[PDB]
Amino acid sequence: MNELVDTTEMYLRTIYDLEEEGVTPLRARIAERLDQSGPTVSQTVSRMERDGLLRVAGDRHLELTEKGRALAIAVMRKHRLAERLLVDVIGLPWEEVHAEACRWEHVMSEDVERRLVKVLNNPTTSPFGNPIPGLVELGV
Numbered sequence: 001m002n003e004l005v006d007t008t009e010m011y012l013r014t015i016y017d018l019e020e021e022g023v024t025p026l027r028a029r030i031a032e033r034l035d036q037s038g039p040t041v042s043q044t045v046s047r048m049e050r051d052g053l054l055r056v057a058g059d060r061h062l063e064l065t066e067k068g069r070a071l072a073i074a075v076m077r078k079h080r081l082a083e084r085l086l087v088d089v090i091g092l093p094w095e096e097v098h099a100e101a102c103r104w105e106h107v108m109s110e111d112v113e114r115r116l117v118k119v120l121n122n123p124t125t126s127p128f129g130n131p132i133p134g135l136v137e138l139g140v
């Protein structure tokens with residue numbers, strides 16, 4: 001746990017970020033970013049390779065497989081959906097929201113999200129400008 005309440009989803013997510021930052025998904029990054037040691041991140045990656053979420057191409061840079069980009073895009077939609085909820089509705093301070101949504105993202109349901117895509121006034125960008133991926137594939 002530890003706010004990284006779901007490693008599998010965190011790894012996948014962090015790559016969505018590295019790609020969104022316009023940077024290279026180097027294991028050095030995911031290890032530092034998540035406070036995991038290299039020997040374990042590769043342990044996790046190989047594991048996630050054996051699960052069909054990622055693929056280690058020539059670049060050696062971990063790549064999101066259709067399943068990985070799938071379980072990555074949704075967690076980012078949940079993440080961002082909660083960010084709106086916390087700011088717009090709950091009113092948590094704008095700077096505390098991220099670390100909050102960073103957790104709730106692993107526990108929010110598609111059923112809840114839809115209610116949010118509805119109840120919430122603007123499900124286009126999360127508070128920090130970021131786009132809300134998956135909307136179409138959510139069912140809204």
Ligand SMILES: [Zn+2]
Nearest residue numbers: 083097098101
């Ligand atoms: Zn955030």
Ligand SMILES: [Zn+2]
Nearest residue numbers: 003004102103
């Ligand atoms: Zn998280």
